[PDB]
Design a protein around this ligand. Structure first.
Ligand SMILES: Nc1ncnc2c1ncn2[C@@H]1O[C@H](COP(=O)(O)OP(=O)(O)O)[C@@H](O)[C@H]1O
Ligand SMILES: Nc1ncnc2c1ncn2[C@@H]1O[C@H](COP(=O)(O)OP(=O)(O)O)[C@@H](O)[C@H]1O
Ligand code: VO4
Ligand code: VO4
Ligand SMILES: [Mg+2]
Ligand SMILES: [Mg+2]
Lengths: 584, 584
């Protein structure tokens, strides 16, 4: 509930560092206290000012006493407002710092979590949650913190004052009033919360549908599907509006009940006071006093019945953000993991059995050894699952059984960072940042110099194409570089991995989008650049890999045939069939 | 400014076809008027109740007179709240309907706009603006509409009452108070707005950067670049927080000045009233009367100073939404465009000159004719720009000069819908909706039956693969189909286009991710399905298109060679070189 959320948020407000920020909170609390004391004082001055005017005076009738007391009243009101604005000004920095640290922590945690949480994740939910939560925590914190506590202080103070100045039927009346108020408010809020949860869930679903439609604009255009999308959005919007109408009607009923109770209590107290006046026990200033005290007390509470809905939503949103921060990490490093030390880059697969889900096993005891410095190819027909090999090597997931070794070391027992530092990959579908081509190429290593980018662009055979562009390296690619052709994007990917210069390199359909001459050029660069590293090339078109040291042919998640190109042509098996057929 | 935004928004509030809602708005305004009248009346009753009890009495001036008037006071207070909540409950339906129609209009317009918009922007900004704006308009409409107009009514009424009951020094004093109030508020708000616009732009930029970081999770993982993104986000967040601190300081100063003016005016009025009382012109009830009137008047205005920031941001966002709605459409249908009639599907290109930007011309007077029913291929090396042809054919852009005709008809003069209805395309990068495989295949034509999907899945040679999946047609595939292999995605794309059954079909490197046997299979299906349509196949690997009726070879935006496969091999030109090289 909300109480747990606030208890979780409380450590951020009173940090255990920054000795400077801690003092400001104390000062702000002191300002709050002075403001309350002044606003509490001013009605006693008003009551006495009224008392003086009627039934004689002490020096002069009203020339001096009435003027002095009216000016004291006005100056008091102004002083209270001044203190309130001063507390706001002093406090605002602590809040800004607290929310900045919350945002930074959530961002870091989201980058640390496992990919399986990224494979099915809607863009709209994450973006909406972070934007909404930052705005939410600022609004909720200010309204919550600075319009509830002083009212409690004033309620206790008023109880004390009634104690000191009257008989205690007033005390019993007010205590019963507060008890009724709390019980009624709680039961109504309980009824209201289920409908609130339903409304919020429907809103989130509608927004995610809308974003997916907008994100697939090309496909919606190709098939003329505009009307279908419009109807699909319209239905969700109507359902949401209905739920909202029910929610606000219940809010209105709760507000009417609360105002009835409050005004009943005021009626009763004023009546008892006038009855007491009839017997000559009390002056009429007592009447003015009680009236002013009650209205001053109840103004902050009546203010709230029109900011309720927002505060509620804010509290929900903050709970949501903590929920996101709490989800656990599926794949983590072991305790005290040693660093990876790569001296001779052999690769061993030892009886690896794996699948994404327990109901579909994909690899069936695949074992093989890739010798250091050798050039090997991995081929198979479609659906083979060869792209898992690579995804497993980077430890995006762990094997159910068996193990992977690099230089004789179990990759489950080493640090993730050294492992991924030792490996380079060129994937099938490469994504570009929304920035210049020069930034995208320099991204491979921290601080890439002009010489490294020039060398890589030469090795990638894109130098002339860039030279003929008007803006050169500053040509914008757009979103996912959708402004560049496929061969251009694949060349940028090759350049990136060239800039990394990793000891072990993986080509994952690296050449599939290029023309023949470009292909032969980059293939020659790849052969030259492979001098003393382990290179694994996964290719569809066999002619580009026929000179490999060894070829692994996978079918249906297992190793069907293994050996050199000549051995497989002699065996007359699957490889021979594939190659012969393709040649014709 | 805000005034223009509100004037634009007002037609949504007072509709013109339902008529049911129009009566409800009238009823709500009537309730507002009753509530204000009651809250205005009850202080006169209080002043008189005070006047009766002191210095005389009509009958029994101790219990009967005082009880009736205090009870009337309490009942009046309660009745005002009751009317206010009743107006809220009655009005709530109109707001929901208005915001629903606004959202629907923005969605439809966003779908109608030109592609060059989409390819220039970030997903996060548009999603943020639509979510933020709907929440913004609802909150702003409620606060704006129901906490400003009654204060104007009350101020005029109080002016009238002072007129009727006193001499007009009070009137001039209030007039001067209002004039000073408005002038001060305007000039301070003017200073504050420049800082506000900067704050908002900085926030938008930071959020866009964050979303692009999250959207490129794979690449950021591949290069261990987490620290760079964390620092990059952190700096923007600090800049934003600084700007926010300046803004709130200026708001605090404005609030203090306003409260000073208000409390000075009350001081003066009550002082003058006491001075007048000293001469016996006025009873003591007058003091309470004036005090209560002023406090009741100013209580709604003191509250606004703590909802100001929110309303301001809301108004900004509502302006933003209309700005988006107004942007003009680059490519529009001509007036009275006739429908397309496809009787003989020939395609003519007539001297088409085009480029994306006026500083880089890509096609240099390309002209050609594709005869109805022929099988033509378009080939070239990389960067050729052959991928522009299709985008031009669908009229995503217009030619600078020349024209394209189908059956002889200028495509610029026909309706966009009939034109795109006659064309099918299989693009290089195919996008999947976040849903099941069956939904994605059935999407090609509205209401697609089970027989058509079965026939298409057979023709695409994916039936066995789907049969071996546990959930079959109900298999989830992620978003952008990132869960499927490349061959699977390309097969789904082929199936969609087969489901459309268009008379003209374009294969844009359709066979690129498949193995040899799958390729030969689908190539046979295509050949069979091509019987009486025009088919244009753009292919990198020449062997797959050697049997075409004719092949067009493009280089650098021009036609290098044209003719049948044997003619080009005899010519010993570019085609011969490319083919020979690839074969070896
Ligand atoms: N995220 C995933 N969730 C569930 N199944 C998956 C996922 N990714 C891949 N699969 C399965 O992995 C196989 C694809 O492996 P892959 O090596 O990419 O084949 P290909 O080389 O033809 O692209 C498919 O059978 C697919 O169903
Ligand atoms: N949307 C675009 N905006 C700016 N330049 C573009 C855009 N699309 C293509 N270009 C340029 O067109 C050429 C590649 O276009 P394309 O037709 O895809 O060639 P190809 O057929 O070889 O893939 C490049 O020069 C590219 O910069
Ligand atoms: O997308 V292309 O440059 O390969 O024709
Ligand atoms: O679908 V694949 O065989 O190209 O990775
Ligand atoms: Mg694969
Ligand atoms: Mg291309």
């Amino acid at each position: 509930d909300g109480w747990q959320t606030l208890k979780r948020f409380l450590p951020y407000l009173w940090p255990a560092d920054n000795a400077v920020l801690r003092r400001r909170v104390v000062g702000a609390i002191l300002m709050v206290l002075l403001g309350k004391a002044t606003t509490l004082a001013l009605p006693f001055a008003y009551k006495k000012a009224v008392d003086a005017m009627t039934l004689g005076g002490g020096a002069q009738p009203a020339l001096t006493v009435a003027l002095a007391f009216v000016l004291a009243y006005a100056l008091g009101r102004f002083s209270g407002v001044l203190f309130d604005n001063l507390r706001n000004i002093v406090f605002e920095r602590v809040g800004q710092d607290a929310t900045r640290h919350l945002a930074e922590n959530v961002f870091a945690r989201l980058h640390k979590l496992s990919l399986r949480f990224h494979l099915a994740r809607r863009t709209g939910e994450v973006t909406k949650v972070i934007e909404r939560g930052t705005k939410s925590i600022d609004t909720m914190l200010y309204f919550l913190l600075f319009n509830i506590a002083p009212t409690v202080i004033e309620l206790t103070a008023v109880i004390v004052i009634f104690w000191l100045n009257f008989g205690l039927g007033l005390v019993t009346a007010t205590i019963l009033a507060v008890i009724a108020y709390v019980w009624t408010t709680r039961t109504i809020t309980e009824w209201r919360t289920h409908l609130r949860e339903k409304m919020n869930r429907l809103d989130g679903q509608a927004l995610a549908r809308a974003v997916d439609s907008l994100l697939n604009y090309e496909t919606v255009k190709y098939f003329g599907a505009e009307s279908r999308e419009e109807a699909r959005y319209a239905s969700a919007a109507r359902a949401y509006a209905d739920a909202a109408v029910k929610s606000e009607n219940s809010l209105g009923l709760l507000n009417i009940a609360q105002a009835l109770i409050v005004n009943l209590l005021m009626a009763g107290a004023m009546a008892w006071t006038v009855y007491g006046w009839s017997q000559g026990k009390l002056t009429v200033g007592d009447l003015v006093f009680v009236n002013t005290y009650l209205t001053q007390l109840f103004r902050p509470l009546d203010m709230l019945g029109m900011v309720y809905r927002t505060i509620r939503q804010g509290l929900i949103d903050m709970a949501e953000m903590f929920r996101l921060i709490d989800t656990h990490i599926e794949v983590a490093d072991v305790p005290n993991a040693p660093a990876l030390v790569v001296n001779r880059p052999s690769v061993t697969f030892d009886n690896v059995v794996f699948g994404y889900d327990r109901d579909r096993e994909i690899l069936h005891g695949l074992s093989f050894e890739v010798a250091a410095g050798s050039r090997v190819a991995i081929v198979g027909p479609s659906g083979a699952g060869k792209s898992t090999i690579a995804r497993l090597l980077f430890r995006f997931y762990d094997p159910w059984e068996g193990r992977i070794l690099i230089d004789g070391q179990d990759i489950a027992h080493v640090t993730q960072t050294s492992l991924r530092a030792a490996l380079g990959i060129v994937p099938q579908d490469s994504v570009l940042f929304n920035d210049t081509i020069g930034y995208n190429i320099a991204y491979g290593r921290d601080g890439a110099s002009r010489a490294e980018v020039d060398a890589a662009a030469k090795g990638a055979a894109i130098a002339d194409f860039i030279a003929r562009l008007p803006q050169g390296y500053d040509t914008e690619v757009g979103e996912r570089g959708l402004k560049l052709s496929g061969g251009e994007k694949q060349r940028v990917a090759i350049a990136r991995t060239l800039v990394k210069n990793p000891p072990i390199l993986l080509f994952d359909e690296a050449t599939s989008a290029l023309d023949t001459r470009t292909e032969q050029d980059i293939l020659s660069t790849m052969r030259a650049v492979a001098s003393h590293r382990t290179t694994i090339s996964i290719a569809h078109r066999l002619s580009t890999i026929a000179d490999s040291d060894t070829i692994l042919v996978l079918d249906q998640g297992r190793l069907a045939e293994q050996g050199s190109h000549l051995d497989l042509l002699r065996r007359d098996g699957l490889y021979a069939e594939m190659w012969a057929r393709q040649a014709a």
